[PDB]
Amino acid sequence: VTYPIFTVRWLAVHTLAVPSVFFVGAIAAMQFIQR
Amino acid sequence: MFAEGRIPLWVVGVVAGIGAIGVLGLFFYGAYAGLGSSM
Amino acid sequence: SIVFQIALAALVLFSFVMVVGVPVAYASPQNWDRSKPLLYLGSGIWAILVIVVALLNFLV
Amino acid sequence: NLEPIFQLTFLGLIVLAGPAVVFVLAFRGGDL
Amino acid sequence: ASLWEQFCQWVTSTNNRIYVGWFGTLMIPTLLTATTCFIIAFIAAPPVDIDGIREPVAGSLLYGNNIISGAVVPSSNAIGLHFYPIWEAASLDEWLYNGGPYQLVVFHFLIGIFCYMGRQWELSYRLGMRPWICVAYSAPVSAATAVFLIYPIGQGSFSDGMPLGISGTFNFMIVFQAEHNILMHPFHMLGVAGVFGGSLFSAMHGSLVTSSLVRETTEVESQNYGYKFGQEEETYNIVAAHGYFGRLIFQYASFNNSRSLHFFLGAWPVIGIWFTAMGVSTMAFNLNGFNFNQSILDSQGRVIGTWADVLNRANIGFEVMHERNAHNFPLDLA
Amino acid sequence: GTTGERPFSDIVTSIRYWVIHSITIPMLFIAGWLFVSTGLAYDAFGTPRPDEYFTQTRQELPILQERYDINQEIQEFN
């Protein structure tokens, strides 16, 4: 109960998830590029 | 919902799974439209 | 001709309401007193809608 | 046009249907 | 009591050094037949006209092959899918020239390996075991059946079965890639995941068990002598192995249940091999790997190359050279 | 067996996590979207747009050939 919020685990999670969601948004947008 | 103050984990799983399925469906759709579709 | 369109759209709507309601009603043993007659009525009305659609197919 | 719009409408309704059944049963106390 | 009953007790006996069983009553003759014919042919078979164009291919050691290049050559394309036993040849020389040894060896081998799988079930039943080792063995059996029977059936000729040789195997694979793009087939990718991952999990499991061995020997003798056959106690510390692995990656990615771990070890390569066997079996019906040739166009309409196009160039290079005298018409449909 | 950190299930089933993330996650999604859809990615990474693979004067592959002055080579490739 009443754990820390920010930890090494928090940083490890975000270091991956944050650019992952950014990249996924980029690729989603690419799905609509027309030649 | 069934309990107050928290979301059931199965509801979160269903929502995240549907989001992931939609993302993969968009990618497969894009395989047939726009760039890389051979048309 | 619009009557067929209306009947088929109604049939799809009633199929949706049956698809939702039937599993809930069969899996709520407490509310079986008032959901068994509702099931009977709904099955009858769904069949009626299907029959009406079938007739309007040849009427349109 | 509108074909993908209507298609996604039907698809989303269908998709919600099953989870709607499970959610309603879970919340109302049905057997699961 | 009766003679037949005595024979039944002998065949199903668990005291035989090699279990025979009822599946064994088929396995042993067919496997011995296949082995003897294979050895004889590999050593001394004369050249075989595999492509049915009167262009015999030397497969045996006595006709100039080494172990790497030697093979039992698939039967002639002229035979197609016809049954070609010895008694349908005018002479043994004709049978040899048309690749009859291949059919004999392959048919007996296939019967033998299916009976081997049944025999695995049978012995598990006689010993009071659980019955599913044969299910694991069904993966290599499925793969072998795909390359020796299913692919020739779909392609319409036993000449398009895998040759029984090392270089023949490579030829089979290269032509297969040229015609089906097996590398770009997701079932073959799953097979690669199956074997790469199976080796990975074999290395991890062996290394984690070896790493966590309980001290029972001295630094002189082999640590293997710390285990005694039939000992009840555990020979390694699975809790220490779990501590190490769950700290190597993270806690919840590490098995601490040996049974779940061993099920995973069994299941991963078996499933991968099932998928790759089905990949070959469905490419037998020319449902091929992905084709992204000229998938990327620039705005004007000129094709922009990708690595798939380079791969296609390699495939074409293989395609135009293979069986160089066998094709009369522009499309390689057969 | 917990190494000290809050269990993931507890965090991701909590209201506060979702109040935070129903905003943060979509914002990164549409930030990557805008990265692509504004043309920023093309210019940042040097990736050709579909109409810039070839120019009205270069119909061939702009394969780099010079060992040290690639900036000028790429500029003459356009």
Added chain:
Amino acid sequence: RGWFDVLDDWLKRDRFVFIGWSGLLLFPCAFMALGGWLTGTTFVTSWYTHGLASSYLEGANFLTVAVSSPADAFGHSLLFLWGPEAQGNLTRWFQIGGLWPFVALHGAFGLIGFMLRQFEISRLVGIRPYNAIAFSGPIAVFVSVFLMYPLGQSSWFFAPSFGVAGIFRFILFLQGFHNWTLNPFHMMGVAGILGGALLCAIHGATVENTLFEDGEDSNTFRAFEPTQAEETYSMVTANRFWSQIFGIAFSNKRWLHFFMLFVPVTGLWMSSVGIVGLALNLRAYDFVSQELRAAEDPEFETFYTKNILLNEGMRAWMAPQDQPHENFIFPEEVLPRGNAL
């Protein structure tokens, strides 16, 4: 308490993700390699190095994206962002294939960091370091294939590209130009990998089907306890089964698991030796006796000679597109091909 001990304490704390001293090397380098691959496959072209589209932005898919090798013009230049080629220009650095050495070198140091992590965690928990020793195999593969092979060749251009179809291209290239399947070191690698898969499957199945009845459920998975002292499956029954089915069987558990380590690791090491050979074009390409006989006897045909013909076809048809910097111009009439095809 000295500052070094305090740092050592913090690095080795029991947390969800262990860091350790090795983490200082592993995590930044591994993150660089992974993010470099993801960035390149998402955004970065190979138009100027290979004349190929290799990113999602260009319309390629998961199977066709890659971090492609740099242009052959750079030889074995390490292609630092600040180096004489890119000269600090990030866009140009991307365009010349600078991401390939970025990923390769950061991945090499990440692999070193991961194996140091295996050593460090093994030492901390008090077990033998055989996991790191097993991991030496993948390290040998990565070193040979991604570093030594291109180093023996003309440039990094001929290293495998970090991508699915890029790897497939590398595989077919090695078949056509090196006859890599004929190489005995590759055959030992194949034997090791297929044997490792076989051992994995057979051991898992054998254990699962000789389990002791330790629970009442049909679900046998919860009839095990990690702290139990006794074996969970019958080694004696397994040994009898395999002795009667196959002729031989393991009787020593320790030897069994060491073998499961040994087979795939030795396979990887042997294949790496073969790749080192191919780096210098020291191939097992031909059997000279059969070549000479075929040259003087036009009726001598083996599967080996047929494979040689396939290699010739692949080289001629693939080289102009695969090696665009060479400006190979092979007119249609010089291309080898069989009849009607």
Added chain:
Amino acid sequence: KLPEAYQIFDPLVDVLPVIPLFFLALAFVWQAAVGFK
């Protein structure tokens, strides 16, 4: 295509055959709601 009177439900018939896949998924939804008992 569909007979003329029915082509307003053309974008509905486009998605009908894929429903049994949703049934298979729904099995897992139901087991997840009950905690995979």
Added chain:
Amino acid sequence: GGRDLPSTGFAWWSGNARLINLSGKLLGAHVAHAGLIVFWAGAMTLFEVAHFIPEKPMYEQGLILLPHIATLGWGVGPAGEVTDIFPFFVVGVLHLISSAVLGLGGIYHALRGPEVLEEYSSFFGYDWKDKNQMTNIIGYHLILLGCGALLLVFKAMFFGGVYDTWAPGGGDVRVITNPTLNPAIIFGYLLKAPFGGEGWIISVNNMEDIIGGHIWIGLICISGGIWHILTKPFGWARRALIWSGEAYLSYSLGALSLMGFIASVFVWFNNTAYPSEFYGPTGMEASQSQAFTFLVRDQRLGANIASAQGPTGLGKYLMRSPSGEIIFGGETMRFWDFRGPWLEPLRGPNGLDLDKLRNDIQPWQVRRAAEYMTHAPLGSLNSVGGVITDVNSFNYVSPRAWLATSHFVLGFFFLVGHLWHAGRARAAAAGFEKGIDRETEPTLFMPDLD
């Protein structure tokens, strides 16, 4: 019955095993699953109708159900031209609605209906060990299966006929007036070698044989149904078989694996029950078509195709089979057992006839050969037609390829399932499916091997 691991002994991922002894719940599962099957039939039919361009061939549009309806003689005319699109729609609609009904019943039995049926009725209640009741269910379903076969016969004979690709004057829907009831032909099909040139039952090549075999199948099934209703398994069957629900499942799995393999082969080779008009050419057909197309072209160019020897010395266009028959040359030599309605008019007693080849080739045969050659069942997974080295502009994968690959895969995995359940049924009947008993571990009482 319980619905969790503690009260059933089965985890969630094997949850359907909890149903083994809950006959009412099991019946609900079966009825609902049948609803799924019928639902797919109806929905796929409506999808295919909606995505059907009726002037383009069926096999060019990824259709697998419409060819089944067309073969039965609905909505098509000569050469397979789609006359009426309504019957396809009707088949789909009827399956969809009936699937609704079946799903309602399956849900009722699975969710609210009686858990078990044995204390409710002796007729529907069953016990897996009750051999007489199991044979009763076999008998009822055998009667139904024979009736369905007779339904096929009645459609072919009295209800407009079936599509006959071998019809004179062109392939057409025709009524079969003279099915072959001769048991020599019907049951000699079962004795033909499953190899090239014989084609055990895949070689059935005329609708008379198909309809007559279905009359025989109907009679066999109905009589066997009565036989099983009125008897109990004999002593030999009792001593040879495992008598349990999982054992019966495993038996059915083996049967299904066999049928899946047979169907894959059947669609790959047979062009009678799978007319090329609707399913496209077989691979054999396409190869033979290419050989024919270039024989025709080069002959028009002036090549004397009887005497033209190819590079190897074999005839370029014509050659002999190993039994002497005159056949197309080239690699298609392997496909000389092929028979097709467009090629048999040029075949003499000795094989391909030079006189017919030189003066009897019709323009429609040339068109058909070109079409079949260009629709060879070769294609990529992403549906790029032609050989794998071709470029992306031809969107085609043969329906034969889809059906054959899918059903070989399903046959294989059902063989796997049969092995799994047969082994498990044996182990459970003998009582060691849960593992080795430490007290009575059988190998501990065995003499050492050496």
